[PDB]
Write a structure and sequence with these properties.
The structure is cut from a larger assembly and holds ten copies of chain A. In chain A, about 45% of the residues lie in helices and about 20% in strands. Chain A is of the alpha/beta class. In chain A, strands 3, 4, 5, 6, 7 and 8 form a six-stranded parallel beta sheet that branches. Chain A has a two-stranded antiparallel ribbon with strand order 1-2. In chain A, helix 2 runs parallel beside helix 3. The radius of gyration of chain A is 16 Å and the shape is globular. Chain A starts with a strand and ends with a strand. Chains D and E meet through strand 2, helix 1, helix 2, helix 3 and helix 5 of D and helix 1 and strand 3 of E. The structure holds the ligand Cc1ccccc1CN1CCn2c1nc(=O)c1c2CCN(Cc2ccccc2)C1 (10 copies). One copy of the ligand Cc1ccccc1CN1CCn2c1nc(=O)c1c2CCN(Cc2ccccc2)C1 sits at the interface of chains G and F. One copy of the ligand Cc1ccccc1CN1CCn2c1nc(=O)c1c2CCN(Cc2ccccc2)C1 binds next to helix 2 and helix 3 of chain E. Chain J: It is found in: Mitochondrion matrix. Chain J: Belongs to the peptidase S14 family. Chain J: One of its GO terms (biological process) is protein quality control for misfolded or incompletely synthesized proteins.
């Protein structure tokens, strides 16, 4: 059951209430239906204002690569500062989106787990998709393409401090 | 669940802005909703553009043909936007946007290959319908379309632009 | 995921414009809903045309015939519109639209082939033959020979055969 | 996905016109709904006719008899209407409409054949259907009984000659 | 879909003090029927309540919970059997206010009973004998002997047996 | 199944003219029992055959197939009820050669019986005739008794004429 | 399946005594086994009779016709025996036994009613059944078709009066 | 199932007059056990028969079929509880020849027992009477004990009269 | 379950090969293994192919077809019950004058409901094989395969699908 | 059910006695295990006598197909490969891996080299080994193998012969 709250100018489900404050949730696996809901919200928040930051809450184990790339491209497309926030975990495509927040604006809570490994179409197309991920990670972490490729080979998570050192995020905060 | 904004679930909100979502697998039920919104949009104004957002793996040929024919029937300019992917019938609808208003975001993947109860001769008839639709809109010859469509591969947005599937690969407003 | 406009669900909105949707397989509950809408529309105006959008692979025969009979029963002209496909009972309903008001989009596919005891099945099948014969103006023997071939017709061939009157591209 | 019309869902709209739908199989939950509608409609006027649309392959016999008894109980004239088909208990409810107010559209199929209890209880129910059919068709028990053995359908005209319906309406 | 009249139809019948027991009895049904009974009693402790029963029976303890609520409320309760009232359903029918227990003409009535120990099964069965004996005024030997026989009673037989008071055709 | 000296133990019992009827009776049980009975008769149309019955009943026509085979062969057939013989199981038990129908002390026997209606009743009437014949009781008494959903103890089954002997030890 | 001595399974043992069991629903693999046995039994002797035990609710029509055609084909007289029931295709095989050698036990039930192909093909199959039933029962095609419309069974004795079988056998 | 050198191990135990009643009792188990009991009597009506019981119980009428068969054959029957004898399993254990009813030291024994009402009661009273006969407890005590959802140790069962010896070593 | 005399191996010892039921890869490799063993026993005496099949996998069928062509033995085909789709191709594929049907069988050359082009390539293989063995034209074969209908054995004889209606 | 024959022998075991190895289904670890065991066994019986390998397969697990391939290359015997019905994906690799001049197809077979829980990198590695294996045995260049394997299509037996997948197409 989604709780209902009231705003002062009607009842909103709590999620719609958070979208009213420019929070966009990316919890759970990323698939085509999640991507279209997230894209619709991002486009709608840009239209409400192309200056005001947008907050993206990420607690995701990854999901469909093309669905995550649609979200990422839409993030790059809008003009707004996008603050990304990792709670719980940001694994595979979820960490790509985390790393894709605006520079200086990528955050994790203290106990989150970050993974850029992609846990286990034609062979040549899987490798093309994978190289697309290498290029995106290189761009946003500032790591080498050869560092990104080697790191992604490793089946392991990063602490928030390591992800900060790696260049996936900027701040690990505890309180406001 | 679907958030509500300003009144409106957010998909209906984008519909009020002349955006029509073609996400996921195309089947008959997707076709009748798209056709429904396309026709309703043409009745709000036959001059204003309509935006078709496409992130689709393909689906039922006849359902896709039905959205195609509706796109060709309405007079409105139709801007097609490829986000994520447009494969099989998805890319036919992308290619079927108004000349010069067919776009892709930079990381999308576009496939014109068709990944593998009617008779053999009717499966061919449908296929030839697609060949001819692709040639009409990509301005490529049938020789190239039939040859290209045999290959189980994706195009990048720039190869797709060069082929005639779309006109613009854009990054920012 | 059915959107809202102005505040109707798009389908109700189309019904307000006198469009009745027959997409998908035809079963008893489709027929009930289609019949409900036709009667309601006739009650709104018995002369204003009614638009019937058909994109159907067919379905239950007696449910098809219930729709067919309700079409012949109401007074309104009915414009039938094939998008995608009209196969089996789908093409029977398309053929049954008011004469000269039967349409197809350019890329639709039309099939009159059909993909209780024996006697009763033949009985239904002959009911079909006769309805087709009436609406296409083809001889029973032609209809019967045509329905044995497992093939679709192009819209222009369907026009030729007498299933529809116009194959249009634009308004 | 039930259309709204103006505000009402279309079945409620029709119920407001004193139409009651009996489409699909008959079971206890269908009989409950049908009975509640007949009873409410009588409450609104015990004189205004009630239209029962029937497109049913039959169903539970005791659920059918519950509807039957409610029909016979309310004072309103009840016009029955066979669209598509009325088989087993469907045809019993059809025949049960007010004399002279039982109709069929031209292409419907009517069947009185019936395609957890003891053998004597099954016969005792069967015999109630003989009596009910004999009453409403004016045929003798031996004829009813002899016909109900035949796994076959009746055309609207045969059904009318038999006493099941009164009128075969084209439009 | 349940039709609307500002009211779904069942709620409409509840406003007229009708309570439907129209399927298998379980805890969920019992909870709903009890809630409706208590509510109707709070609207008026003198106005009759109508209990509609078309049920094959169900969970004994759940049937007994409804029974106890019928006895607890002061209101007259008219019980009406349509279709059937078997096992616990015929217990509730027999538990209507004396003189106010009805059946439509073609219903059938069964007092036969088509994890807990043997002794407990038997205690519940004896509770059923006692309750039937009270409301039918038959002896415990007669109740028990009758419930062994797997058979249905006609409305008339059920009247002679003390299960109901009136078998009626029309109002 | 164990091997004994080499045979599986049921085949070993088959060589001693023992045929087992354990479990529900269906057509494959019937074909297997019939095959064994016919084979045993061919080994000797005089030596007794022992039929061990522990069964809740089963398909009526399959049960009648065993019955007819039993009546067909010339051998004396000793029937032995261990555990239970219910419905068709107790028919076969009763159809043993007169003087040679047996039960163990704690078995339970039931003659109650837990296609179109006329056909279910034709089968039931056939069961009535067979039970009267082999219990040597009037058909009126069988028919009344079979309505009662209950078991008999071996002594009661003996008094009723279903069997001849209740044995504890080899007497 | 129990084993019997002079040592194998009871059903094969019956086969050696020229009995062929049609004891369940008829489908293609049952038709295949039956035909195999029939053709085998003719090889062992083309004159000795063959016993076909039928207890069957029917089954696939073309599978039943395969068995029928094999019965008319082989030279041996074929004695059909109904135990339990013979409905739809089961009764057609019953009635197709050699004239004077079609039996039932007393309490059998016999039914000729028939409780992805086009309508036309289903009718053609139905007419084939009429022709075969008319043949072996000596009844008129008009009467056979009237009979098959009725959802009912016949006692062994009325199946005899009808022409489906020749003897209602109590004991030997 | 391993073959030894009567070659599969279960059949080999049958040659030494052992009958296995392991697992739930249903009609098919009853039929096999009865067949072996009858077969063993035919080999000899004097040589003891050993019945190994490790059962949670099962279908009551199937259990009474085995019980009647044990009471029918003339052999001494030694019953042996390993693991557990619950519900019908403990009836069979208690039905061994007086003096020859055994348990292993860690077995658990339950006489509790985890159609129309009257018929269910009838079956229960048959159980009461069988237990009273072989345990020599009163029907009063038996019926009370069968209400309690509990197991007994082998010694408690011996003192109850369900068995005669709690065996440790041969 | 299968009687012992098993009844299938027995019929194999007399050069009968059963193609009853749907044709898939497993059926194909059994039939082929039996055709090759049968030819190996003698490349001269005939082989009987018993056929009651609704069809099956086209490449499984063609594998059987190609092995029938390959072996030198004559092949009597017999249709009991039905030979539809691939089944009727194997029927027509027996030695000319050695193709039979029993009187009530049903025969169907219609194919009741990989890339589109590969579907059509297979379909044209069938047109050609049918044209060969029936001595009909590719045009009539194609118009015939379009109709969803069965042929009586007598029609299948007229058509060239078989020779003798025993 | 697998016919038996006297030479006793289920008909597959009979074929194996004549040095025929069947590979006539989807290829997986279990099939590969059987095929390798038979190949090794046939070699032990005679490391000169040719071995016949029948192929009617839609492909299967790559690593299982490569295990069969490596075994073919390891045994010294000549390996005649025969394609009936179809050899697709890994099946066509084994077909092309028979001894030069001893790769055959029946006239109506269909041949496909197209490939209808591991990382992107490892899938590329496997596809590379298939390019190399196909290049070696067809004699085509790596470029030609790669672009031909991208096309979702079947070759006829003559196309496959001229492509270098097989040596002979024969009717009888
Ligand atoms: C969206 C919206 C919602 C409520 C009110 C106003 C608006 C403003 N509109 C109207 C139309 N439109 C708007 N904004 C937008 O960004 C876009 C459109 C149309 C197309 N397009 C391309 C695109 C870019 C990236 C992902 C996918 C598609 C972006
Ligand atoms: C649809 C609508 C919705 C809200 C308000 C006004 C309207 C205007 N109407 C009314 C009727 N009608 C309208 N427009 C349309 O385009 C069409 C119709 C009717 C029929 N027809 C054929 C067609 C064409 C292509 C795809 C399938 C069918 C198109
Ligand atoms: C339907 C309606 C809905 C909203 C407002 C007014 C109305 C007008 N009414 C009221 C009752 N009635 C109306 N029209 C109609 O055509 C019909 C009826 C009743 C019966 N009947 C027979 C029939 C014909 C063919 C298919 C099945 C049944 C047609
Ligand atoms: C029903 C209704 C609904 C909205 C407004 C007013 C009313 C009028 N009331 C009130 C109570 N009552 C009414 N009518 C009726 O026919 C009946 C009742 C009560 C009982 N009873 C017996 C019965 C007959 C046949 C089937 C089952 C039960 C019929
Ligand atoms: C229930 C109600 C509903 C709407 C408005 C007013 C009321 C009046 N109240 C309030 C509390 N209460 C009422 N009536 C009642 O009969 C009862 C109660 C409370 C408890 N109790 C015992 C009981 C008896 C038998 C079945 C189960 C429980 C009966
Ligand atoms: C059966 C058998 C088995 C092993 C050795 C010899 C035999 C002897 N045969 C051979 C054929 N036959 C024999 N006995 C028999 O009783 C019967 C037959 C044939 C037919 N028939 C009618 C029948 C009666 C009742 C149930 C069903 C059918 C009885
Ligand atoms: C069958 C058999 C088994 C073991 C030993 C010898 C034999 C005798 N053979 C050998 C081959 N053959 C024999 N008999 C036969 O009737 C037939 C054949 C071959 C073909 N054919 C046509 C046919 C007719 C109707 C249904 C299907 C097929 C009948
Ligand atoms: C069983 C056997 C096996 C191999 C060799 C010889 C024998 C001896 N026979 C032959 C037949 N028969 C034998 N013994 C027996 O105790 C019994 C029989 C027959 C019947 N009957 C009644 C019974 C008792 C209790 C449970 C169920 C049935 C006991
Ligand atoms: C088969 C057999 C079985 C038992 C004993 C001896 C033999 C004779 N051999 C030995 C090997 N071999 C034999 N015959 C044959 O026809 C064939 C072979 C080997 C290969 N080959 C090609 C082929 C043809 C068509 C379908 C598929 C493959 C035919
Ligand atoms: C196999 C066999 C079977 C029956 C009789 C004699 C033999 C001969 N042996 C005995 C052991 N051995 C034999 N042959 C062989 O080729 C091989 C071995 C052992 C190991 N090895 C490596 C290998 C090669 C390729 C695939 C996997 C493993 C090959």
């Amino acid at each position: 059951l989604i709780p209902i709250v009231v705003e002062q100018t009607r009842a909103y489900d709590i999620y719609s209430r958070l979208l009213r404050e420019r929070i966009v949730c990316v919890m759970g696996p990323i698939d085509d239906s999640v991507a279209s809901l997230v894209i619709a919200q991002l486009l709608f928040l840009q239209s409400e204002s192309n200056k005001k930051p947008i907050h993206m809450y990420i607690n995701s184990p990854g999901g469909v690569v093309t669905a995550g790339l649609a979200i990422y491209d839409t993030m790059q497309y809008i003009l707004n500062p996008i603050c990304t926030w990792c709670v719980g975990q940001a694994a595979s495509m979820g960490s790509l989106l985390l790393a894709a927040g605006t520079p200086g604006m990528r955050h994790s809570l203290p106990n989150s787990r970050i993974m850029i490994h992609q846990p286990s179409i034609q062979a040549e197309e899987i490798m093309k998709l994978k190289k697309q991920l290498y290029n995106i990670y290189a761009k946003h972490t500032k790591q080498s393409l050869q560092v990104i490729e080697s790191a992604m080979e490793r089946d392991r998570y990063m602490s928030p401090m390591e992800a900060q050192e790696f260049g996936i995020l900027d701040k690990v905060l505890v309180h406001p």
